[PDB]
Amino acid sequence: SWSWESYLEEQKAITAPVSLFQDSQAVTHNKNGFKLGMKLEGIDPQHPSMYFILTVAEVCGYRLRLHFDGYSECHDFWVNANSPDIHPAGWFEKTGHKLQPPKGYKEEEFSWSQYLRSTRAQAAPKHLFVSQSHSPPPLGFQVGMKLEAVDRMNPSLVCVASVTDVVDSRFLVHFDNWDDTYDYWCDPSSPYIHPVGWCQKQGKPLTPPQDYPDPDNFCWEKYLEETGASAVPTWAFKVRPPHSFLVNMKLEAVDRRNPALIRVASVEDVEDHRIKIHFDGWSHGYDFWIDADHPDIHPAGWCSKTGHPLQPPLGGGGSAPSTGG
Ligand SMILES: CN(C)CCCC[C@H](N)C(=O)O
Incomplete structure (x- = not known):
């Protein structure tokens, strides 16, 4: 032993x-109350802005393996029972989010009641979870505000970004005019985000929106005026100690x-x-x-x-x- x-x-x-x-x-x-076969909703870890129908493929301790219904098992991934990236069936419709239906379906074509009949399965109970979007929002961060953020896919780049969604205590960071595969969820203490103007004060090059006209002369004030958007206020950033x-x-x-x-x-x-x-x-x-x-x-x-x-x-x-x- x-x-x-x-x-x-x-x-x-x-x-x-x-x-x-x-x-x-x-x-x-x-307690981990998830059981094999239970179905639920969740974001694709490799595409944080997308939601899919998921099934509990395996349970181990306080963890569980999730499977994308209709797709290859090679996409299966593990999460902890307290993951904030999964939600109970009906969450997307209740909160107004979009669902990427199971392979072989079209979106008009999906209804949880019918799907559960077709698969002779049950949805994971609501109490089994942690995020269903009844929680306190991240103070100072609203959809539409802009900021500067590190592209986790290309770490040396700090770019012009926007808050595109807020769910409970987190918010989604999106890179302006870039595809959403680069999006990632954050909270106010993330060391990967900064207020508008940070790069200039640090002397670091700022990556403008994709194909921004005359990128070299990118000016935040001009962009904020063009978009009518506000910058996330400085006070909202609560940097985490190393x-x-x-x-x-x-x-x-x-x-x-x-x-x-x-x-x-x-x-x-x-x-x-x-x-x-x-x-x-x-x-x-x-x-x-x-x-x-x-x-x-x-x-x-x-x-x-x-x-x-x-x-x-x-x-x-x-x-x-x-x-x-
Ligand atoms: C800035 N960051 C959010 C996205 C970088 C994308 C690089 C890719 N080779 C391309 O040019 O599409």
Whole structure:
């Protein structure tokens, strides 16, 4: 039997304190009421502005694997039961959002009552969730306002962006005149967003809207006038202090190569808002960077307290394939 207590003694190591994580990353006493076969609604992680019909394909501890109805299983993805990116059946119609129907359907063609009959299934109960859009909005951020944001797909770019939607306590960041595949959900403390004018005060180049006429001479004031849009007010931005994870601290993290697994991990390197994860016993070739507030990193003990299997360090110490670290 593997235990953190014994491992720390053996390695003469320390864990990353629970206080370093967000409450949502650390909470272990919540029940996961989702069951295999339950259907629901959710955003496509690779297309944050789109909503699809999803089915619980697997349950493990406080996590569940979701399947896009009608599409290939290669698109399946895992989330935690407290994910704010899934909603109960009927949410889209109740909140006025659009649905991308199951493969083989047209949008006019979808009705939850009929679909459940056709699939002889049941929708996940409303109480099973966390976001159904009854919550406090993000103060100061309204649809239509503009701001500057980092393109997470092209990290060196800070661009002209807009708030295109607000759901409970989060808002959707959209890159002006770029396709919505670049959109991503945020909250007021995100270190990836800044008020209009930030780049100029920092000396950083600002990426104007796609194909903006004479891009070199882009001027926020002129653009705000052309669009009649307001800039998100400066007071609304509540910058988050850099995290306090230190190199070598131990924790638990979802494996990026096989998301069904969670392994014993160590902080390999650090940035102001991200940490580099290294899986104990493994080579460093699989090490990866991840946001400090990412939903897939947790404090030691998360797995055992939630009922999820934890992969112990890989054995072999260099003599076995993929080891050395
Ligand atoms: C700025 N960012 C939001 C989008 C960048 C898109 C780059 C892509 N090669 C293209 O030119 O379409």
